[PDB]
Every structure is written in structure tokens, then in C-alpha cells.
């Protein structure tokens, strides 16, 4: 009713083409096909066997329209270190979420320390069920609120530090 969507990964026509740093070997676009053969465009990284990971993935520029306070809803799934065969002392079961406020919608190389940290996201009590035909994905669902924003728009970023993450859906919205 009063929700205005500022970004929905599930609705974007074609590739997301967010920005992965690193560009190869970190976050990669993986397409899970729903019953109609419509891509569901996920972002995944699972280098749990390999130390000192620092993999970033950021969105396109997102306009805030009028709003100071935005809401971020992520549906994801994490492989617990417990369930992954291998000796892996640097395995992790969270990722970090960041934002960068910019008037410039073609920011190219925004640096790590310009990003401002929202939270560490973990698989927790809340989940959802997304029926895609052949399967039902059971996924974690977390929402965070960021603000107060005061620039034409912003960038979201997800940092991986040694986890096995699938980000299946990212919606960003505000309440009008």
C-alpha cells in the first residue's frame, strides 16, 4: 500500500551486472530458473577453503526519491561450516552489509573505507518459502532499516569474509 520499491533484483530485466570486487573468483551471478524459465538472478560466493577473504559486491546507484529512511529486505541461504566437508578454520556463517551515500549515479571506484556499515547478517529465526515449481526454496529473510539519508541516492554493498552465501533476492524500499 504505502511501500515504494527503489530496487528489486527479481524484477530487473536482463543481467544485474552489479560490481564485483574482485571481478573474477569472488561474487558471481548465478541464474536459478523458475517454472516459466525466467532467470532468478542470484549472487553467490563460496571460497570457504581459502584464507583472508574480502569479497565485495555493490549495487548500481539507487535513488532515494524523497525518503530519508529506506528498508532493505534480503532473502538468502548460507551453508553452515558444520555441513561443508573440509578442514577450514576461516569459514564464516555471516556476511556484512554496507551503504555509500552519493549524488553521483556513475561512481566507478568507490573505496572500502567510504562504505558505512549497516549490520552483520546471519541466518537467524526468520525464513520464507519461494515456490519455483520443481522445488521450494526455503531461505533466510532479513530486513534492515538504513537512514537518515541526505543525498540524491546511494549504493548498497555486501562483503564476504569466508562464507558460503547465496543472495537470492534484494529488495529496497521506503514507506510513502
Amino acid at each position: 500500500g504505502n511501500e515504494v520499491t527503489l530496487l528489486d533484483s527479481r524484477s530487473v530485466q536482463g543481467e544485474l551486472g552489479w560490481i564485483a570486487s574482485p571481478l573474477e573468483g569472488g561474487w558471481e551471478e548465478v541464474s536459478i530458473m523458475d517454472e516459466k524459465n525466467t532467470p532468478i538472478r542470484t549472487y553467490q560466493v563460496c571460497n570457504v577453503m581459502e584464507p583472508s577473504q574480502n569479497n565485495w559486491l555493490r549495487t548500481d546507484w539507487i535513488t532515494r526519491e524523497g525518503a530519508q529512511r529506506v528498508y532493505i529486505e534480503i532473502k538468502f541461504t548460507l551453508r553452515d561450516c558444520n555441513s561443508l566437508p573440509g578442514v577450514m578454520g576461516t569459514c564464516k556463517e555471516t556476511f556484512n552489509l554496507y551503504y555509500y551515500e552519493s549524488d553521483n549515479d556513475k561512481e566507478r571506484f568507490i573505496r572500502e573505507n567510504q562504505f558505512v556499515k549497516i549490520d552483520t547478517i546471519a541466518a537467524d529465526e526468520s525464513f520464507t518459502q519461494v515456490d519455483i515449481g520443481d522445488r521450494i526454496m526455503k531461505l533466510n529473510t532479513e530486513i534492515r532499516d538504513v537512514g537518515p539519508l541526505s543525498k540524491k541516492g546511494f549504493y548498497l554493498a555486501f562483503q564476504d569474509v569466508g562464507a558460503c552465501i547465496a543472495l537470492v533476492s534484494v529488495r529496497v524500499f521506503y514507506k510513502k
Binding site: 553467490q44 570457504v48 541461504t77 551453508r79 561443508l84 558460503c164 547465496a166
Partner: peptide, 12 residues
């Protein structure tokens, strides 16, 4: 490569 890939279920 990724050790595991989420496709429906995780595949490692």
C-alpha cells in the same frame, strides 16, 4: 571455483 553452488539445493 566455488566449492558449493546453490541451484533449489546446495550442490558441493
Amino acid at each position: 571455483a566455488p566449492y558449493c553452488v546453490y541451484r533449489x539445493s546446495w550442490s558441493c
